[PDB]
Amino acid sequence: MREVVIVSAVRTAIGSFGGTLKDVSAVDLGAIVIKEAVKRAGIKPEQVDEVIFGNVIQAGVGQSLARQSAVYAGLPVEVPAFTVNKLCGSGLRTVSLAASLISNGDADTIVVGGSENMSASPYLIPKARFGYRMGEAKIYDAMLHDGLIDSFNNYHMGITAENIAEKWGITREDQDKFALASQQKAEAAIKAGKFKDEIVPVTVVVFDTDEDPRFGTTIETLAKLKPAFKTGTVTAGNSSGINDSSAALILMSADKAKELGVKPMAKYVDFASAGLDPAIMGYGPYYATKKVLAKTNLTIKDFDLIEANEAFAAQSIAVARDLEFDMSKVNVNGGAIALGHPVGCSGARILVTLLHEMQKRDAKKGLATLCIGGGQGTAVVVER
Amino acid sequence: MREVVIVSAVRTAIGSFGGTLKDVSAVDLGAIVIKEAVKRAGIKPEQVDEVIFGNVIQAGVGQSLARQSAVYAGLPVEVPAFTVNKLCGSGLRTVSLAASLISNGDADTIVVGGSENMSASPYLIPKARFGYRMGEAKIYDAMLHDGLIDSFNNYHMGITAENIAEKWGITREDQDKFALASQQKAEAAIKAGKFKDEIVPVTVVFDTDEDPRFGTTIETLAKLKPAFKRDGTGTVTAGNSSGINDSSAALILMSADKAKELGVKPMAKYVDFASAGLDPAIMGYGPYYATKKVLAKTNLTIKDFDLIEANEAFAAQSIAVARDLEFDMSKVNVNGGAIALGHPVGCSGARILVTLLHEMQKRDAKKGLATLCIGGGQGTAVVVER
Amino acid sequence: MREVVIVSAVRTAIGSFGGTLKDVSAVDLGAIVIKEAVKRAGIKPEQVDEVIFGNVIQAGVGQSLARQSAVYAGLPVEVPAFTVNKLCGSGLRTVSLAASLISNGDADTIVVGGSENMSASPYLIPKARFGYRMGEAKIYDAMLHDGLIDSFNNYHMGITAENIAEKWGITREDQDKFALASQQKAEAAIKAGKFKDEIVPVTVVFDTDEDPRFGTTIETLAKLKPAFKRDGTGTVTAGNSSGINDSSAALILMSADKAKELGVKPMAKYVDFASAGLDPAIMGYGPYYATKKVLAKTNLTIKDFDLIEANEAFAAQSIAVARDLEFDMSKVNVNGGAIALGHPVGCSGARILVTLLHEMQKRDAKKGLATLCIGGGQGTAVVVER
Amino acid sequence: MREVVIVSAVRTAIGSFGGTLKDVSAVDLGAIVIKEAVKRAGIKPEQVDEVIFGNVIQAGVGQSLARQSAVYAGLPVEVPAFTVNKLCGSGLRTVSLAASLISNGDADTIVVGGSENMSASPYLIPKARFGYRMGEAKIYDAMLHDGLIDSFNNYHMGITAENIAEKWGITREDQDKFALASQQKAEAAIKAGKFKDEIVPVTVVVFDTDEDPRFGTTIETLAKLKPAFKTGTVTAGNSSGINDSSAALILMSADKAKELGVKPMAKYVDFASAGLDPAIMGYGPYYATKKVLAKTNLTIKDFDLIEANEAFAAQSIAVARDLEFDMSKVNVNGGAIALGHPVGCSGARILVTLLHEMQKRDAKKGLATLCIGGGQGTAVVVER
């Protein structure tokens, strides 16, 4: 093995569904963050060995996004690239993969991250090729069909949250209280400038501020909302949204960062992925996190900051209780309920957020983890 | 770093465009080969640590194919999985990635491969969400738009074959002759039983590659019309291109340590890989750069390979590559290649490796190369050794 | 008021669903029959004063079919035209309308008829304009949505046939026996050359009705499964319903005065018409009301007709009608009906009239009735006389 | 022959494209005006003998609109109905047809008119049935494909106006001056309440006022606009719009109006239709009007009011010059440039407008005429 470091990390502000980044392609969002990450690391484009990038709703983006974003970022055509799809886990799995390839000597410098434009995703017509012959037929929303709908059970991932709420005893009030605190933390962090260092502006009008948060959210406001997916408890107010954004990081061997005089943001320690019953996919962080702790001989007390993606309050609460998070150190600047869940990006997005806040607080150790549609979880530990 | 071995390798026969596997989903084809791969390895399902699988035209297959296929194959829900898209390279990149992960200690046993159902791929309506407002618009073929059309130049990958025929001076006749040999070798290989070991039956009982055109003659090929250009300048035809096809393939890589512990007799040792980028406009030449690079990593030359699988996307790109890497053509695609057999994009990279390993065993061959060009301007390669 | 005569009558043979005319547009089929109708009348094109033509599934045919067909048929651009949509009734309503116009002095010579290409009809995307925003949606078959599904009940017109089989107590066996006779008579009529005079060839050389199922037996019909209900309650099948079909038909009506002036020998005199509405849920019974009404206008009874064409949309509705109007069945659909020949919706009403006039001439018959049921809950009828 | 009278006439306000009537089906608009026309004539529903109704973009309205609108209007199911498609001429051709049927003794009472919702029209996928096999394909806008595009020449009807502008020497300035006067007349008529008697409200918010007119239009505003269809001169400012609306009238034999004590609004005199070269379809009113004058032994001087549909300024100007209209008596309350052109309705719409203004002015004779896509024109003369 060899030591791996993270040398730069950047993200766009997160667009709302049908919002300010609705007409900026996933490809273009990826290009902006790849270019900017290279700039921030102070290396040459030619120094990148590979690009590994998340993208989940691939329908209609054209050939393999990673390759497109790399070239339009201005990396040489000589740089090879591939696209990862681990659903919600995509952006964060690019990180661990890269660290493994560098550790094993297969590369020195890899650009990682993820891009998703859920707004711009198309509809699908399954039998346009050989025809329907007779009778009405269904067109599908690619973002749901290839993303947010569990393919095994053919229900929304919202139902997986209700399953967890039921099975873990998580009340509507608890869910809404969790949501409120995400909105509160997010509004305070935005106005306090916490995200200024990590965000690259996009000109569409200069878009530089996360727009999904609902400032002034109250417990009463949340309480009014109707369950969105079914007896229900999971609403659009206590669930992440549908969003458009990208994020990029650069991993390097400690060897090559030294040679080039590149100052690392943090050390990559390790990762873990786990599968579990699709019907409770939201609990996957439990298994992932446990595994990475057994690999690293660590404990939850050893983390100064935790980014745990907030797909749904119900799943986040279940995770937090069973890993026994200290919630003072979780998602300190807000989480996905407020900020958004651009599926193929989020995993990298939360790592970008973690790293910059780790710097501001001079934290030692850090955990990023999130649930994955179809029944998975993945986690990464960093240290400074 | 640790040694990595290949313990099993299996594929479906390759369906034609709108042919016998047109209604078996990419997901189901993947399950079949993942299932059989595990069975052939003599391993329990719970032994698998991860599934890394290729799938290029992902429109309408549902959530990430790798996880769906792994679960429908009977692998425990505890096994994590993800889907790789390096276009035509996908299936072979799953192999090199898994090797790096096992070598780095991040796993002991990984299922890899790829599945593509090009026939079942949908059309797309880009502005159905917020509306077209007024006037005509276009719906797109997912297989072309997300696969076989170069997204930088917005022309078909067949034009890249044309760009290469122009710059390397590869005539229509040279292309047709390469295509005839590919058809001849596939016919003899099929009739000689060469594919019987590696193919797993699919009851729709489909067990024979159906895209080959038995009795192909040079005159046959000369009658066909340029498929991508017309206007006089064309040389690439349906007869000297790979087809559009539906198939899956799977392999199991394992640390040498874990193999020995379990008493699994490996098929072969994984040696190394390389990937390279180049000008998208001549993407077909990617094997050259990828092969030169893996050769340098392994300290081998082309003479060292008993058997070579170089994927036949287009005769025009395969000829440029063979010339510039100075292949001994008697050792290349000995059982026929994609012109004859087909090019199920996300599967092919794994497919050619299963074909290579089986021929290597038949021949007691010592060293093997699998390489292929990649839409967008890339190439990847893997060396194996027995 | 003035006398109106029919001077020419012609149809294409009837194409099957996805059959030989599937790629000849409704517009082109209309041009063919309008062309030949004029030629058969021995009239110059410039003699035509108006074209009134039927077309039901208008989605994607372009601007108003009547005008397109009239111009492509070589009629002067000066000839005005419009398209009638009374669903299944359309082609026959063009006839009665033109008669009223000529009788009222608003024209001397009118081309009438209908054209339907059901095979070539498109699908619809209702919210493509302003967008679906989120989630699954439906695309609709134009032929069902704008034709064969009752828009008030949103069930298929086949259910209306089921409603009638229930209320009139018409068994599956009665339906199958009516269907067998229709298949028998069409086979004999075709082989006897009965359709040779009225049919105009279309080179795609299509000149023979292709929907009939020669050698139909009662056992054949009994094997088929209910097409519209299932759940046990079904009796209406593909074998005892009309099909989905593609064809055109045209006729030329003229004042008796203008006919004599020009020396045009008429085929027949137009007598009168009636149209009626009823409960959409039993739309198939519309002929009863329409026929009772035209009988009252003309002071005739059913016994007075030598020949009857009652369109066979569904055996179930045709049996109810025949019973309640007390038809002499030996005089009905003597050359077979729509179960055998097909139901190209916007054409059929004209089609059955061309078939009637030709048989009337063969038989030197004196009086004739053409009637058919209409989706939405209507019926229309026309009496003619030689 | 027998005398025919018009006993009632009514229309909805005309919706803008994507405007207030975008989600009120053509069927429903037809039902509102049929019901209201019956009410205004003071007859029973059972007294209607037949419904003949215009509808041009039929794609996706379901089975034959005339029949649907009749039943949902509350006319007995016993009433027979059929739908006419003479493109732009549809609504007015229903009138003449009906008068012929009544004159000939085939009916006593016919409801006529037209309904078009252009907004709600769908897109078309030609080969969904037997499939596209491979490669991109086109979806079509039904309103253009089955309506506003000349099927012979495969160009917009806008090009037919440019053809006329070129061939008749009609300048951009002349076109824009014509447009301005339509807007001016329309704004004045609306604010003056001229349309209050003829409009039936629709609750969607009570919609009762034509919304397409652009109040405050200036010659300078028009002059700024860019040609819309090609050297060009025809803009969206000097062309009718795309619109949603319905209109209904009731024709009766003089015999039956007498029997029932129904007070007629006017006498139907006669009509004419004409075909001409599709490429100059806008000039069809010339031929139509000439023919109806030869039938009625009348002259343009004999009309106290003229409604000449304003498809395009260029065609309207050409028509007006060659028939030598006195433009003081044409479209006195504004025309389609301001008000809109709901294709299947317009022909009936202009007759509704004509009749009510004929009443207000106590005019004796009246002409309604309009051009028809695909190369036609149609005209009707009424008298009080």
Author numbering:
A (entry chain B), D (entry chain B): 1 to 204, 211 to 236, 240 to 393
B (entry chain A), C (entry chain A): 1 to 204, 212 to 393
Question: What do the authors of the reporting publication say about this deposited model?
Answer:
Among all r‐BOX or RBO genes, thl_1583, which encodes β‐ketothiolase (MhTHL), is identified as the most critical enzyme for the carbon chain elongation mechanism in M. hexanoica.
The THL from C. kluyveri (CkTHL) was selected as C. kluyveri serves as a model n‐caproate producer. The respective thiolase activities were compared by inserting CkTHL ReBktB, EcAtoB, CaTHL, and MhTHL into the platform strain E. coli SK‐1. The strain containing MhTHL produced more n‐caproate than the strains encoding other thiolase genes, reaching a final concentration of 1.25 g L−1. We then superimposed the MhTHL structure on the crystal structures of well‐known thiolases, such as EcAtoB, ReBktB, CaTHL, and CkTHL, to investigate their structural differences. The overall structures were relatively identical, with alpha carbon RMS distances of 0.50, 0.62, 0.53, and 0.46, respectively. L87 and V351 in MhTHL and the corresponding L87 and V352 in CkTHL modulated the pocket size to a greater extent than the valine and isoleucine residues in EcAtoB and CaTHL. This corresponds to the n‐caproate production results in the platform strain SK‐1 with altered thiolases.
